[PDB]
Design an enzyme around this catalytic site. Structure first.
Site, mmCIF file in Angstrom:
data_model
loop_
_atom_site.group_PDB
_atom_site.id
_atom_site.type_symbol
_atom_site.label_atom_id
_atom_site.label_comp_id
_atom_site.label_asym_id
_atom_site.label_seq_id
_atom_site.Cartn_x
_atom_site.Cartn_y
_atom_site.Cartn_z
ATOM 1 N N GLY A 1 33.698 44.046 28.803
ATOM 2 C CA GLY A 1 32.325 44.535 28.880
ATOM 3 C C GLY A 1 32.107 45.763 27.998
ATOM 4 N N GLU B 1 33.841 35.693 28.090
ATOM 5 C CA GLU B 1 34.281 36.302 26.839
ATOM 6 C C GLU B 1 33.564 35.771 25.606
ATOM 7 O OE1 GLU B 1 38.466 37.869 28.633
ATOM 8 O OE2 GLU B 1 38.302 37.670 26.456
ATOM 9 N N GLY C 1 37.599 50.840 25.352
ATOM 10 C CA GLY C 1 37.905 49.825 26.354
ATOM 11 C C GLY C 1 39.390 49.670 26.504
ATOM 12 N N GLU D 1 36.162 53.123 32.716
ATOM 13 C CA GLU D 1 36.865 53.357 33.979
ATOM 14 C C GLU D 1 38.006 54.204 33.534
ATOM 15 O OE1 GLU D 1 40.221 49.778 34.127
ATOM 16 O OE2 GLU D 1 40.118 51.678 35.208
ATOM 17 N N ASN E 1 44.287 36.829 19.998
ATOM 18 C CA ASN E 1 45.392 36.939 20.922
ATOM 19 C C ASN E 1 46.209 35.674 20.974
ATOM 20 O OD1 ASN E 1 45.480 39.507 21.829
ATOM 21 N ND2 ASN E 1 44.196 39.188 23.622
ATOM 22 N N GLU F 1 37.508 51.709 -0.431
ATOM 23 C CA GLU F 1 38.288 50.810 -1.274
ATOM 24 C C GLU F 1 38.643 49.506 -0.558
ATOM 25 O OE1 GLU F 1 41.352 53.111 -3.501
ATOM 26 O OE2 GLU F 1 42.134 51.088 -4.010
ATOM 27 N N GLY G 1 34.578 47.017 25.641
ATOM 28 C CA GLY G 1 34.947 46.634 24.291
ATOM 29 C C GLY G 1 33.839 45.953 23.510
#
Ligand SMILES: CC[C@]1(O)C[C@@H]2CN(CCc3c([nH]c4ccccc34)[C@@](C(=O)OC)(c3cc4c(cc3OC)N(C)[C@H]3[C@@](O)(C(=O)OC)[C@H](OC(C)=O)[C@]5(CC)C=CCN6CC[C@]43[C@@H]65)C2)C1
Ligand SMILES: Nc1nc2c(ncn2[C@@H]2O[C@H](COP(=O)(O)OP(=O)(O)OP(=O)(O)O)[C@@H](O)[C@H]2O)c(=O)[nH]1
Ligand SMILES: Nc1ncnc2c1ncn2[C@@H]1O[C@H](COP(=O)(O)OP(=O)(O)CP(=O)(O)O)[C@@H](O)[C@H]1O
Ligand SMILES: Nc1nc2c(ncn2[C@@H]2O[C@H](COP(=O)(O)OP(=O)(O)O)[C@@H](O)[C@H]2O)c(=O)[nH]1
Ligand SMILES: [Ca+2]
Ligand SMILES: [Ca+2]
Ligand SMILES: [Mg+2]
Ligand SMILES: [Mg+2]
Lengths: 54, 346, 427, 439
Positions: free
Chosen positions: D144, D183, D10, D71, D206, D254, D146
């Site tokens: 969508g 989201e 994505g 896309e 974010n 690990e 991702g």
């Protein structure tokens, strides 16, 4: 307090410091759940086209 | 226009802060689940602290300090005092106490080790549980807790309290403390003595109207006799201390109160401060103390959601708006508190 | 390279559609010839969305022009950008529709509809990846209204998995005289509720009020009204035509804007409002922001304060501070939070494009899905009932084969739409 | 040596990946054309950097990476940008049309038409792997693709490569830069469906990143470029042990052993310090104490939350630069007394430490100042559940009215997948609460 596992090299070093001790689906079931969804799409599109034909 | 929401309808105090803010004409109350607030007056349980400080364009403030429950539940309080070095087992001003569980962690063993050096001293061996009971006998209390269900606290009872004459009476002191977002610790100059209305009965513990000084348990059992509502305020009790004992409130009692308050709240500052955080907290506490016959002040408990006494709402709730709220959110266009600060050099 | 096919139908459709092609061609540096003479690469990066390329490095609008009378199509041809359109994409009849939806939908329009679809199909076939269709039309006449909706239905049959978007001009007795307009409009709204994904409500009532009260045009014409319609169409299609993050295609817009499939009727707004006359001062970011949300800036005659915003998109154009945009956008939501449904978190999205519109340094376009659009539908509904309860003017429609039942179903669906908005205005 | 394949899915995965591979190249002195002078074994090796880069006869070092987007716009930019020769065109896979911010369209509708090609492209890389350990997967929770395609990919990778480890880098949604109102729906759906298939996932909010860039890099309005260079610094910090000689976190297994004792609770918190503007004229270099202490400030975390009100289960510190153990232990001693650091009763209160002497490499003309020493702390704390609660409340609000649900049903998904995804998150919130709180 206690340092342990000291590992040195030219790139860096690493170690552990302790302050205190303690006290799957098949390729099948997947391909199936994907195909029930595509069926559900196809039916919903069919219901629309049938409606448009009326 | 600043915005706020209310999520505890039963709060005597935050009812009054609501109205005080609306009446400024510079604050709008929003529906309680609208997340675009400046101020949350929060519920009492499970207040969703995790959702605060994530609305861009809003500086957000809430009227509780997360993690303050550690001071404000009895079980927690004893644990805090013992384990924290700034306080310690040595700590002079908290009654000897122990956390005890029903057999449905514990320190029952360690309770008895001190009991049976008062049956090896024959000296005062009276204690108290956490709906609550006072005995001298151990197994009458342990059998009371197990016949109850929750975690409990067993505490030394002050056999030798200061008694108000006329009346040979018992009282406790409530002081109100506001800790702002900067962690300024503000004590309200008005405290209140919540009095007993019946002679203190040395030799008979069941008659509980004389041993427990709660405002209700006097209401629902002489209530009103010597002063309104079994409530004596600071001018009167200062006067009585002067006339009867030749001392003052400030000197005999208040220095100790101020000292205990600062000690408790500086202890937990690192755990609850909101200084570098993405939302800000303040909170009003109620500290309750007991004064022994020597004029030694003892810490009894801390309440995270105190109610105020009637005469004083008007003034205290305004003080909250002044220093807790409008210091974060100014308007256009005397202090009822004493700031508690002390940097001794050693 | 995610293509849109544009269809414009009837007088109104073709007039506002032609003005759209003038405006965006200019924004993309295309001239009447179809030749690029622009000075920037940002104009050409998603040019293929609206224009096809041709031998010669020529750009040809992916536009289909449709009417039942030749009149306005000659107008488009002799117009300024008339030469730019593909000549075989002019599909037109001779008889007209006489402001009668039934003629548009069932009798005169059926005869022409297949030829329009051949041209559509040919344009769809040469499409790398078709996103869907945009149609322009009025709802108060016969061809745009009746044939435009017939088209929409036929296009959905052949491309049921493509997005259908309209710019639909809503009638007002402040502008127009003809007594059956509410009939044609109610019947068309019925279709639009079932067969489009996004509909821009462009209300002639509001275009009149703006021109007359606010712009002090005491002799307003369609040019004036249309000057507002083209600004708004430029603005709502900005995210489709230029590089960008938000609402960059029709399907993304719809997912962001339509929480319930029937509530897909948007209130557009624009700032600053002007008449075709020099603007001496660029607005500041706070002014745009306040104005784009002002009731007086809406292109549908609804009071936003009488409803709640379900979703909103906002588009700022020009060289300005993204910080200040962000701050002002937030200030709006935080200062009027009760107006925005709380059960859709962060329902306002904000885009900024640097290429401003022609003749303005700064502009802002608003797109609201607000429950207050019901007021528009109640207004059409009241007009409709007044006549329909006495079956007045119905013979114009029964004489082309319609039954009254069909009118009762349209009124009912439209009344249902209004109560659904009401339902979400109180939730 | 054991190879690691990276998969970027994505727009978010791809753009972050870009920035990572740029950084890795600079870190290992590999040029844009893929040549590495300092590598003397031409045409092969089992050096530490080879875990990520493979070699050609021609002296070319090529990432063990596949990028997929439904896309093409974004990946096209990789295809023609400063690193075009680095990758083989078979590693860059694109579709025609995206998933329109719809989990269900990325998972069910467009997923199906492209999953098999992606697996075949992934196998081409696994077939050049003498002893592949597994996969590092990069994607957004909110897109969508991702969300939807990643979760399908992960289901299939468990089938084709069961014994192998899968780590994620996941971008958690924030309205300041988000592009879709759904989201939250997508993020719950993909978390529900990816949870069993992921051994260890590093979430990056974010919001957290955006504020670090505002506040500490004085960037009025941060772009994805700003955010992604910072994310790549953290990512580099975390994967440095896989690409460099050392003894801490040398294989993917690990990570799980050091950071994830309870499998569902597999979301370690990253905190990073120091972040310093390159435009800052005058800068006083910070000590080991200072940067280590800063790892306990919420404002430096990749997810804002409050570790004081929760418990730890594991804690690593990964230092880069002029750092020696004596200084680390002294910093830790001080901190242990100044702060609330509470482990779970069944765990040693303790830190594992990795030092690599080479200081952070910085991208030239970027926003970040080159610094003498930095550190990245990975702590698995229960406090990270605050982010689950935030996302869950948003989900509950919309789902309660079925807002937007029809978009997902339309692509063939059933309403019940929503309530089922959410029941899984409610259970996850509970696991974190059992572990992390007492009374
Ligand atoms: C934008 C398109 C438009 O030009 C808008 C108006 C109407 N038409 C044609 C232009 C026109 C107008 N007036 C005309 C008179 C004769 C011939 C043509 C016109 C027009 C205008 O320029 O006025 C100066 C106009 C017309 C009206 C008009 C306004 C108007 O321009 C200002 N009105 C809002 C209505 C009207 O019904 C109304 O309610 O006005 C109070 C109005 O009644 C009045 C003035 O008493 C009136 C006037 C002819 C009565 C018959 C019904 N129609 C509906 C439209 C209305 C009109 C302008 C199309
Ligand atoms: N940190 C960061 N976040 C990003 C980036 N690009 C998108 N996002 C975030 O990820 C979410 C959007 O998902 P994208 O990755 O763009 O979506 P996609 O996977 O391409 O999915 P579709 O376009 O729906 O097919 C939002 O929260 C964005 O803020 C990026 O380059 N860096
Ligand atoms: N160790 C002790 N010595 C003397 N009196 C005690 C005591 N512990 C409790 N009491 C008495 O019991 C009263 C109420 O007890 P406590 O304050 O523990 O319960 P509580 O929480 O229901 C009332 P509040 O919330 O106002 O403090 C005190 O005011 C005091 O008179
Ligand atoms: N805004 C606008 N409205 C128009 C225009 N032309 C016609 N109308 C309106 O559209 C309706 C008449 O429809 P029209 O398009 O002429 O009929 P058609 O040609 O059969 O589709 C009335 O509401 C008119 O006010 C125009 O150029 N602009
Ligand atoms: Ca005919
Ligand atoms: Ca080599
Ligand atoms: Mg006409
Ligand atoms: Mg995408």
């Amino acid at each position: 307090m206690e340092v342990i596992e000291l590992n040195k090299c030219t790139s860096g070093q690493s170690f552990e410091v302790i302050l205190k001790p303690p006290s799957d689906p098949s390729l099948e079931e997947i391909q199936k759940k994907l195909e029930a969804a595509e069926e559900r799409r196809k039916y919903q599109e069919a219901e629309l086209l049938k409606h448009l034909a009326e | 226009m600043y915005t706020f929401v209310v999520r505890d309808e039963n709060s005597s105090v935050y009812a009054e802060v609501s109205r005080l803010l609306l009446a400024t004409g510079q604050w709008k109350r929003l529906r309680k689940d609208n997340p675009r607030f400046n101020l949350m007056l929060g519920e009492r349980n499970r207040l969703p602290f995790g959702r605060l400080g994530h609305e861009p364009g809003l500086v957000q403030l809430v009227n509780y300090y997360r993690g303050a429950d550690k001071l404000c539940r009895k079980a927690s309080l004893v644990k805090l005092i013992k384990t924290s070095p700034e306080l310690s087992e040595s700590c002079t001003w908290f009654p000897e106490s122990y956390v005890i569980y029903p057999t449905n962690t514990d320190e029952r063993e360690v309770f008895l080790a001190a009991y049976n050096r008062r049956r090896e001293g024959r000296e005062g061996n009276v204690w108290i549980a956490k709906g609550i009971l006072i005995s001298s006998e151990a197994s009458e209390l342990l059998d009371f807790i197990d016949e109850q269900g929750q975690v409990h606290v067993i505490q030394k009872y002050l056999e030798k309290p200061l008694l108000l004459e006329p009346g040979h009476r018992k009282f406790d002191i409530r002081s109100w403390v506001l800790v702002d977002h900067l962690y300024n610790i503000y004590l309200y100059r008005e405290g209140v003595l919540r009095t007993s209305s019946e002679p203190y009965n040395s030799a008979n513990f069941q008659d509980k109207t004389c041993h427990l000084t709660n405002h209700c348990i006097q209401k629902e059992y002489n209530y009103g006799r010597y002063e309104e509502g079994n409530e004596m305020f600071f001018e009167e009790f200062n006067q009585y201390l002067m006339d009867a004992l030749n001392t003052t409130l400030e000197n005999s009692i208040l220095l100790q109160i101020k000292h205990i308050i600062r000690s408790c709240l500086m202890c937990i500052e690192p755990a609850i401060s909101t200084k570098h955080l993405h939302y800000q907290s303040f909170q009003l506490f109620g500290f309750d103390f007991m004064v022994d016959e020597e004029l030694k002040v003892w810490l009894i408990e801390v309440n995270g959601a105190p109610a105020c006494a009637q005469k004083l709402y008007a003034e205290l709730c305004q003080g909250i708006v002044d220093v807790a709220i409008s210091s974060v959110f100014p308007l256009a266009d005397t202090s009822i508190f004493i700031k508690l600060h002390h940097h001794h050099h050693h | 390279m995610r293509e849109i096919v544009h269809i414009q139908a009837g007088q109104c459709g073709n007039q506002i559609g032609a003005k759209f092609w003038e405006v965006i061609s200019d924004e993309h540096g295309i001239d009447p010839t179809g030749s690029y003479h622009g000075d920037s690469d940002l104009q050409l990066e998603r040019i293929n969305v609206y224009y096809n390329e041709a031998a010669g490095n020529k750009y040809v609008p992916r536009a289909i022009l449709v009417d039942l009378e030749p009149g306005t199509m000659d107008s488009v041809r002799s117009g300024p950008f008339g030469q730019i359109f593909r000549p075989d994409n002019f599909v037109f009849g001779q008889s007209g529709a006489g402001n009668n939806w039934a003629k548009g939908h069932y009798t005169e329009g059926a005869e022409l509809v297949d030829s329009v679809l051949d041209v559509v199909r040919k344009e769809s076939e040469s499409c790398d990846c078709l996103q869907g269709f945009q149609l322009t039309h009025s709802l108060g006449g016969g061809t745009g209204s009746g044939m435009g909706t017939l088209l929409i239905s036929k296009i959905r049959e052949e491309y049921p998995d493509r997005i259908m978007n309209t710019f639909s001009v809503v009638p007002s007795p402040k502008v127009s005289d003809t007594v059956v307009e509410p009939y044609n409009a109610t019947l068309s709204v019925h279709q639009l509720v079932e067969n489009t994904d996004e509909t821009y409500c462009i209300d002639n009532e509001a275009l009149y009020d703006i021109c007359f009260r606010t712009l002090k045009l005491t002799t307003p014409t369609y040019g004036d009204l249309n000057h507002l319609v083209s600004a708004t169409m430029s603005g709502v299609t900005t995210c489709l035509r230029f590089p960008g993050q938000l609402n960059a295609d029709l399907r993304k817009l719809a997912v962001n804007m339509v929480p319930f499939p029937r509530l897909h009727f948007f209130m557009p707004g624009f700032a600053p409002l002007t008449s075709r006359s020099q603007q001496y001062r660029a607005l500041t970011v706070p002014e745009l922001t306040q104005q784009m949300f002002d009731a007086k800036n809406m292109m549908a005659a609804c009071d936003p304060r009488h409803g709640r915003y379900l979703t909103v998109a906002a588009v700022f154009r020009g060289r300005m501070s993204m910080k200040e945009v962000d701050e002002q956008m937030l200030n709006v939501q935080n200062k009027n939070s009760s107006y925005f449904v709380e059960w859709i978190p962060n329902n306002v999205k904000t885009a900024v494009c640097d290429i401003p519109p022609r003749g303005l340094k700064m502009s802002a376009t608003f797109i609201g899905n607000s429950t207050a659009i019901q007021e528009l539908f109640k207004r059409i509904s009241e007009q409709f009932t007044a006549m329909f309860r006495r079956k007045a003017f119905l013979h114009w429609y029964t004489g082309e084969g319609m039954d009254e039942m069909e009118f009762t179903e349209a009124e009912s669906n439209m009344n249902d739409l209004v109560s659904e908005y009401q339902q979400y205005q109180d939730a | 040596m054991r190879e690691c394949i990276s998969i970027h899915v994505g727009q978010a995965g791809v753009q972050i990946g870009n920035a990572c591979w740029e950084l890795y190249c600079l870190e290992h002195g590999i040029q844009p054309d893929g040549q590495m002078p300092s590598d003397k074994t031409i045409g092969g090796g089992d050096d530490s950097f080879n875990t990520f880069f493979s070699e050609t006869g021609a002296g070319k070092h090529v990432p063990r990476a596949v990028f997929v987007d439904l896309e093409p716009t974004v990946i096209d930019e990789v295809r023609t940008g400063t690193y075009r020769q680095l990758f083989h065109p078979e590693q860059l896979i694109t579709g025609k049309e995206d998933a329109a911010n719809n989990y269900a369209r990325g998972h069910y509708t467009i997923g199906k038409e492209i999953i098999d090609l992606v697996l075949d492209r992934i196998r081409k890389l696994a077939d050049q792997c003498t002893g592949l350990q597994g996969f590092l997967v990069f994607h957004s929770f909110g897109g969508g693709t991702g969300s939807g395609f990643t979760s399908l990919l992960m289901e299939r990778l468990s089938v084709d490569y069961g014994k192998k480890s899968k780590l994620e880098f996941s971008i958690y949604p924030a309205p300041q830069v988000s592009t879709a109102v759904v989201e939250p729906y997508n993020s719950i759906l993909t978390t529900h469906t990816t949870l069993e298939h992921s051994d260890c996932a590093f979430m990056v909010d974010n919001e957290a990143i955006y504020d670090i860039c505002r506040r500490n890099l004085d960037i009025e309005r941060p772009t994805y470029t700003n955010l992604n260079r910072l994310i790549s610094q953290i990512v580099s910090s975390i994967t440095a042990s896989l690409r460099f000689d050392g003894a801490l976190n040398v294989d993917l297994t690990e990570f799980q052993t050091n950071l994830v004792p309870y499998p569902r609770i597999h979301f370690p918190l990253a905190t990073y310090a120091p972040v310093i503007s390159a435009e800052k004229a005058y800068h006083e270099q910070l000590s080991v104490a200072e940067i280590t202490n800063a790892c306990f400030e919420p404002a430096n975390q990749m997810v804002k939350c409050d570790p004081r009100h929760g418990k730890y289960m594991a804690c690593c510190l990964l230092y880069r630069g002029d750092v020696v153990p004596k200084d680390v232990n002294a910093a830790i001693a001080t901190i242990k007394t100044k702060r609330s650091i509470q482990f779970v009763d069944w765990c040693p209160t303790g830190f594992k430490v990795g030092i690599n002497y080479q200081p952070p490499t910085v991208v030239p003309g970027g926003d970040l100042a080159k610094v003498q020493r930095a550190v990245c702390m990975l702590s698995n704390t229960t406090a990270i559940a605050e982010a689950w609660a935030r996302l869950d409340h948003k989900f509950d609000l919309m789902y309660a009215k079925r807002a937007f649900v029809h978009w997902y049903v339309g692509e063939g998904m059933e309403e019940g997948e929503f309530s089922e995804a959410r029941e899984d998150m409610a259970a996850l919130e509970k696991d974190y609460e059992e572990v992390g709180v007492d009374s």
